[PDB]
Amino acid sequence: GSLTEDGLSYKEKFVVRSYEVGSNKTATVETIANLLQEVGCNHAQSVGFSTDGFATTTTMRKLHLIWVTARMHIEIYKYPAWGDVVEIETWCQSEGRIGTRRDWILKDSVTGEVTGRATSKWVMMNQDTRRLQKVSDDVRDEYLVFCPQEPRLAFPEENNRSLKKIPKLEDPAQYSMIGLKPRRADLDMNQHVNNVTYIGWVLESIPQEIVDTHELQVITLDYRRECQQDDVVDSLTTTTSDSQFLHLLRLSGDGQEINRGTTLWRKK
Amino acid sequence: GSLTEDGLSYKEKFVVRSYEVGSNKTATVETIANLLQEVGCNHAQSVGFSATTTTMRKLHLIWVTARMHIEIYKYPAWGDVVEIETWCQSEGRIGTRRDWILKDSVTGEVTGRATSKWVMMNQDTRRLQKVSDDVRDEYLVFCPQEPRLAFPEENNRSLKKIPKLEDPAQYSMIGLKPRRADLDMNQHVNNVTYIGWVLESIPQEIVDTHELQVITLDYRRECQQDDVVDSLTTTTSNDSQFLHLLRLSGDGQEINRGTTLWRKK
Numbered sequence A: 001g002s003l004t005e006d007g008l009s010y011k012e013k014f015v016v017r018s019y020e021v022g023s024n025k026t027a028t029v030e031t032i033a034n035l036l037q038e039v040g041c042n043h044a045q046s047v048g049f050s051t052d053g054f055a056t057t058t059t060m061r062k063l064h065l066i067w068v069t070a071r072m073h074i075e076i077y078k079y080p081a082w083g084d085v086v087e088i089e090t091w092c093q094s095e096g097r098i099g100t101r102r103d104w105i106l107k108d109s110v111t112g113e114v115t116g117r118a119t120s121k122w123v124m125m126n127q128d129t130r131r132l133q134k135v136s137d138d139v140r141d142e143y144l145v146f147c148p149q150e151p152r153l154a155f156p157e158e159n160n161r162s163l164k165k166i167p168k169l170e171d172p173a174q175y176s177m178i179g180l181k182p183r184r185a186d187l188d189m190n191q192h193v194n195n196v197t198y199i200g201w202v203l204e205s206i207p208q209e210i211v212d213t214h215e216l217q218v219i220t221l222d223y224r225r226e227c228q229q230d231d232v233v234d235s236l237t238t239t240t241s242d243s244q245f246l247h248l249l250r251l252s253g254d255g256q257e258i259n260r261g262t263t264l265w266r267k268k
Numbered sequence B: 001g002s003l004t005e006d007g008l009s010y011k012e013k014f015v016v017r018s019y020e021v022g023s024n025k026t027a028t029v030e031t032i033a034n035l036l037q038e039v040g041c042n043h044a045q046s047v048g049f050s051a052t053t054t055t056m057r058k059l060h061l062i063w064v065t066a067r068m069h070i071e072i073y074k075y076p077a078w079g080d081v082v083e084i085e086t087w088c089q090s091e092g093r094i095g096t097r098r099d100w101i102l103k104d105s106v107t108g109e110v111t112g113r114a115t116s117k118w119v120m121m122n123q124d125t126r127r128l129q130k131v132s133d134d135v136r137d138e139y140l141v142f143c144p145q146e147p148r149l150a151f152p153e154e155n156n157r158s159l160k161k162i163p164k165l166e167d168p169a170q171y172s173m174i175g176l177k178p179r180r181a182d183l184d185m186n187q188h189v190n191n192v193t194y195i196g197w198v199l200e201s202i203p204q205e206i207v208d209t210h211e212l213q214v215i216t217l218d219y220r221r222e223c224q225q226d227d228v229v230d231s232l233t234t235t236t237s238n239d240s241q242f243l244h245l246l247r248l249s250g251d252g253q254e255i256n257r258g259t260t261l262w263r264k265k
């Protein structure tokens, strides 16, 4: 992989692996989400930031501050096949004091056509107290020299799906998958549950018949609270409709919300 | 990746990814096991298999893993390039063997090695069978004729008999279930998931202060998509050794048995 000519974005190619594909012999949405995080990490390393998933700067490290995902939005037009080469371009933008945004464009390497796009909202948090804060001038200036100055959006359209408000699923859920627990392979290098695991847990409550006859086109996921290594999760889904669903991940015991989301599926 | 000059083995390079590493910023044993299966699949494609032969496909026959044995001397770091060479050998009518050698691409030194035993099974009835001459001849032209072993030693760890863990287990992890990411392209639980489930019953203190050196895993029965598994471990031992058992949560039906060897960091 490499930073582009102007140094304001990063590109990387990936060959889709045999264990990365589902029943249609094309990459799963979790494989796509892992590749998005991999190219994001390689972009941060290339410009001298922390590589542990937090993309931390000098002044953030001293203050015990980290970047955490608030929302992930992914739209796939065509899933790359096993053995195919996918090219992913990524860039970051400051969103004033609110936080940062990381965007991605996925392309078929052979044809050059756009096969997918993604966007993510990140907020600043103290890693110890878990308290959120606005972005200071000191931190904005340090990130701004690595971001395009004019707006560059993967989702430019007015009132697009990436900015919609997600409601809270009401009991009873139409479908559920209970007792979901992370194993060591679900953890990152910091022993925290990887953000992609939550995407998998959301999808666990979609019936197998939908998965077998439909393709996932859009997924929007809000992150409210983290699942700890010894926590247990319940995944809930209700049809709201193409097939659309409303999703809720909550702790198995007290019912504490960890995530909420929506998915849109197209008939094969 | 590519077949080597003589066409009897296959090599491929991999750059270790950020999500593929553990707490020490080096590849997990499950990442290694996934790379081993990926290079095995690329070797099969390069010589025209899909790893069934023409005779196997009409008879509804498949190769299934009976045992996996992996030894790691040094886990590759995040961002490091690892080179893996793999080859197959026929073991008469018993089945086949796939071997691997892992090397650090920069230094060229051997950082790991692995071996696996495969048996022929009817896809539908799940009945095992001896390898016929028709199948044997079809794959022999893709294998070295003289023996080539990743584990040549006289009394090596890859061929040891594994006993059945006796209740009560010293440690356990209960209620393990596969999710869709644990399934392969055929909707079967990926062989690497079982390695993860075995390791789930090792205490976090061992993982935090030791490095996994050797893992030997026998495959007896498959975990179905709607099955639930219990992972059991008992210490058998500067080095720590454990005996492992995976069994179905309900009836206690054995699915796997294994052993692990860990060295102090």
Ligand SMILES: CNc1nccc2ccccc12
Pocket: A066, A068, A127, A190, A192, A193, A194, A195, A226
């Ligand atoms: C995936 N990592 C994380 N997600 C949420 C909150 C976190 C707080 C501290 C360190 C890591 C965190």
Ligand SMILES: CNc1nccc2ccccc12
Pocket: B062, B064, B123, B186, B188, B189, B190, B191, B222
């Ligand atoms: C990982 N795949 C498998 N493991 C065991 C038995 C199997 C039987 C039929 C098809 C696939 C099988």
